[PDB]
A paper describes a structure:
Vibrio cholerae contains multiple copies of chemotaxis response regulator (VcCheY1–VcCheY4) whose functions are elusive yet. Autophosphorylated CheA then donates phosphate to the response regulator CheY. Phosphorylated CheY interacts with the flagellar motor protein FliM and influence the direction of flagellar rotation from counter clock wise (CCW) to clock wise (CW). As expected, both VcCheY3 and VcCheY4 possess (β/α)5 fold typical of the response regulators.
We have solved the structures of VcCheY3 in Ca2+ and Mg2+ bound states to the resolutions of 1.67 Å and 2.2 Å respectively. The location of the Ca2+ (or Mg2+) ion in VcCheY3 is similar to that of Mg2+ ion in StCheY. The Ca2+ (or Mg2+) of VcCheY3 is heptacoordinated where four coordinations occur with protein atoms and three with water molecules. Although D12 of StCheY is not coordinated to Mg2+, D15 of VcCheY3 that corresponds to D12 of StCheY, coordinates with the metal ion. The average coordination distance between Ca2+ and the protein atoms is about 2.4 Å while this is of about 2.1 Å in case of Mg2+ which is due to the size difference of the ions. D60 is the site of phosphorylation in VcCheY3 as it corresponds to D57 of StCheY. Both in the Mg2+ and Ca2+ bound free state structures of VcCheY3, the side chain of W61 (that corresponds to W58 of StCheY) is observed in a conformation, substantially different from that of StCheY. From the crystal structures of Ca2+ and Mg2+ bound VcCheY3 we proposed the presence of a conformational barrier composed of the hydrophobic packing of W61, M88 and V106 and a unique hydrogen bond between T90 and Q97 in VcCheY3.
Numbering used by the authors: 5 to 128
The structure:
């Protein structure tokens, strides 16, 4: 239930990456790294032996859902737990992400407490 887990944080707005990185810092996970887009995240996952991915859903290059799909179709990557960050869980979006295989979702603006709750849910 490891706090050394290697985490990738994906999102185009560096200030949001930095909030996420902190939040996870309050919770005991310090092993976090960043990518600014699914285009930049895929090569980091592919070569860097990650355990966990927190991805925004809206990115101009390759969208959250395209990253998730790329991860799930890669035998190497296929086991990764993925939390998606959304500005609003319209159900059509959550449904579609669940189909695509996400482990959970969390609505922004979120908190540490909600982050943990979400972390617990996914990992069972
Ligand atoms: Mg975004």
């Amino acid at each position: 239930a490891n706090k050394n887990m290697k985490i990738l944080i994906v999102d185009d707005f560096s200030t949001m990456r930095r909030i996420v990185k902190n939040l996870l810092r309050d919770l005991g996970f310090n092993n976090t790294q960043e990518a600014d887009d699914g285009l930049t995240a895929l090569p980091m996952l592919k070569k860097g032996d990650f355990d966990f991915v927190v991805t925004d859903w809206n990115m101009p290059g390759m969208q959250g859902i395209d990253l998730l799909k790329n991860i799930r179709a890669d035998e190497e990557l296929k086991h990764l737990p993925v939390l998606m960050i959304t500005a609003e869980a319209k159900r059509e979006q959550i449904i579609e992400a669940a189909q695509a295989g996400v482990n959970g979702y969390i609505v922004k603006p979120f908190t540490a407490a909600t982050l943990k709750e979400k972390l617990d849910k996914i990992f069972e």
